[PDB]
Ligand SMILES: [Mn+2]
Ligand SMILES: [Mn+2]
């Protein structure tokens with residue numbers, strides 16, 4: 001549970017709510033927080049349009065996304081791709097004063113969106129960023145699915161090593177723990193049909209990457225079918241792949257409503273989590289397969305990450321966004337990987353339907369224009385309160401969930417009881433209106449940049465310092481820490 | 496066609512288009528115009544949220560609408576109804592410097608939206624404003640459909656005479672030419688079912704108004720059926736009512752997509768225009784009926800106004816807004832009122848489907864999320880280019896259509912050939928971001944107040960001066976005039 005101490009600037013409505021009162025008074029433009037303290041922040045040249053966060057050592061990388069739209073060709077988007085667009089390199093050697101140092105604006109890094117990852121492996125420091133909108137059928141070379149691969153041995157000055165062109169649109173990338181492979185998801189155009197897969201790129205030689213192939217899911221009957229994974233995480237020894245899956249070509253993963261719909265009938269589906277045996281690739285077997293070991297239905301289509309809670313292996317999975325009551329993370333016990341089981345769920349008060357109905361300025365029932373001219377309630381013109389990524393503090397020794405909830409800001413969750421996750425803290429960064437990459441009312445995500453902000457990035461926990469790193473669309477890159485009281489309570493070590 | 500000459504600041508893209516290049520460069524925040532010049536303007540305490548324009552003599556009345564939403568109870572919306580919300584009284588005695596003088600904030604005027612009209616009749620000047628959102632079933636008395644009635648004998652200081660409670664939601668009001676009756680449309684909750692009607696209120700004593708009843712449409716078969724008129728206009732002798740009609744209970748009238756749908760294929764349908772014989776009410780017959788004289792299919796559901804073009808009686812009707820390719824006015828010949836005939840259409844290039852397609856950043860066929868996660872093209876994030884009201888310069892001697900096109904600004908159209916209306920001028924006011932009534936990204940109309948403005952009001956032409964009055968959502972009240980060149984070519988007096 002969350003205790004309010006003198007340090008805090010707590011939420012003024014329901015848990016996770018941005019109240020219309022605060023929007024009108026201007027209060028919503030300033031931060032809210034409990035259980036945490038801001039260490040440092042940079043608005044990254046006041047740019048806006050921030051999305052993904054990756055890191056190598058003491059350097060953060062923050063991608064950008066264009067208002068022109070998720071799938072719009074980069075060649076048609078020059079008005080939205082000039083500086084300060086691109087992946088910003090941020091010096092965090094002093095976390096009280098993070099400092100943006102340069103912009104990567106190569107084919108993959110100019111509009112990386114969700115398609116960026118970095119890894120510090122033994123003797124290999126790598127940053128990759130890809131053209132999230134690239135490779136859509138019928139376009140030319142300029143608009144292909146480019147992947148820019150950087151040697152980040154000097155993390156403050158990543159050196160472009162090569163640019164590889166995928167044979168399909170790649171949505172998210174995950175570099176293997178040894179830094180020598182990149183796993184790229186294909187969700188488009190298959191989407192709900194499940195006709196996509198997981199691409200593998202060998203980047204042992206960063207200057208000369210070698211395409212491995214497009215993988216489907218292989219079942220015990222020996223047959224392979226497509227799937228459309230959104231993102232994968234990878235086990236420590238690379239022998240397990242944990243896929244968050246939107247759909248299967250076998251058709252047994254139900255697909256639901258648009259996560260950007262404002263209201264309000266059909267629901268968003270959670271999608272499934274697949275655990276995949278990746279031993280074939282690890283051991284260099286010919287005709288390699290990715291074999292289905294187990295499946296957690298409703299496990300979460302958007303992101304899944306590994307966790308170890310009191311010595312017991314778990315996964316944390318979630319869908320994303322969604323109109324009220326939105327979407328939220330689920331805790332999945334994988335002690336038996338052949339039979340994963342959802343053991344707990346973490347939800348805010350704003351993820352309860354009854355609550356969402358109670359705050360509306362007008363009840364759906366009273367709306368004569370309902371089918372005729374659908375108009376969202378004013379409470380739905382702020383931004384979704386639902387997951388967008390769902391990380392943990394330490395995969396190998398997990399206590400805390402670090403859960404971005406988009407307009408709900410970043411939620412800090414005690415996971416020590418996996419059947420009963422509870423909030424212990426949160427940070428909402430306020431607002432930063434009129435930025436170059438998020439201004440002009442041209443946004444497409446439903447985030448209202450005039451009055452609030454949205455946290456959409458992966459979240460880092462640094463055990464040495466206790467610092468938590470995250471990026472928010474308009475306010476930029478933040479470093480926060482737990483307050484002394486909460487830290488003492490969690491019995492985290494102390495330095 | 497628009498002669499672009501000195502003093503003009505032309506549109507840069509297709510006719511009616513707000514170009515993404517201009518949004519990004521900031522050019523969209525400044526006015527565009529051809530054929531006209533600005534005489535004067537007031538931003539009305541820089542308030543935003545303006546909608547309807549009415550007038551008496553040298554005073555303008557401008558309504559507001561709240562961000563809380565079209566049908567949200569006023570009692571639940573106090574955060575959106577603080578000053579400067581309300582009907583603003585504007586002194587236009589000096590058109591070069593119109594001045595906001597007063598704010599009317601009674602039950603009907605606090606949030607009037609489209610529901611406001613004023614008339615200057617012999618021995619009577621009257622302004623009425625009604626709670627557009629009032630009278631939804633299951634609410635308290637404070638949230639009823641109130642109509643505030645003002646004696647505007649002194650147009651700068653309208654005096655509240657009474658507040659009348661309609662027995663249903665009333666959407667638009669039209670005062671009769673003699674100033675003695677108010678015609679109020681009921682479109683909610685019936686909407687597409689056609690189950691509504693036309694309410695009539697006697698206001699000959701403004702302090703003691705008397706309800707005359709709710710009327711349907713009576714046909715030759717002797718039956719009366721409901722209809723949902725959005726707005727009516729009335730003939731000079733009140734014996735004819737021209738109704739813009741969304742739907743009929745007889746179901747003959749095509750009802751289509753949402754006017755506010757972002758990016759949809761399915762077009763907004765035009766609805767129908769009904770000509771109604773109103774002689775029963777005029778002559779004071781008991782159990783009065785409104786009898787269908789004629790019907791113009793596709794005539795326009797939103798607004799219809801009379802026009803006289805080279806001595807021949809016409810109507811100009813239109814639907815409203817809508818995604819590309821939007822909605823646009825139609826010219827209707829009613830020389831035979833029993834058989835109204837659409838004879839012309841005024842369309843902008845932005846009302847052509849193939850142009851709408853050509854400006855998209857991404858073609859529909861290239862979007863794999865098209866059904867799965869529908870997302871409007873960036874070109875659809877500015878505001879509809881489609882009619883919102885569709886007036887003429889002088890109903891009795893018509894030369895020009897004065898056509899608000901929302902994000903398209905106000906279009907000035909040569910109607911002298913009713914089969915071939917042609918544009919001769921326009922004014923787009925630019926942008927006025929961060930107003931208290933239109934700011935904070937809380938709009939529901941689809942208007943992007945950060946980079947453009949929306950023209951939604953009725954439009955006044957003053958024959959004596961040549962001045963044209965209109966209101967825009969964020970930029971406020973404007974007075975413009977035709978160029979000397981335009982006036983001469985069109986054959987206007989001097
Ligand atoms: Mn994605
Ligand atoms: Mn996402």
Ligand SMILES: [Mn+2]
Pocket residue numbers: 609666725
């Ligand atoms: Mn209306």
Ligand SMILES: [Mn+2]
Pocket residue numbers: 609797815883
């Ligand atoms: Mn309207």
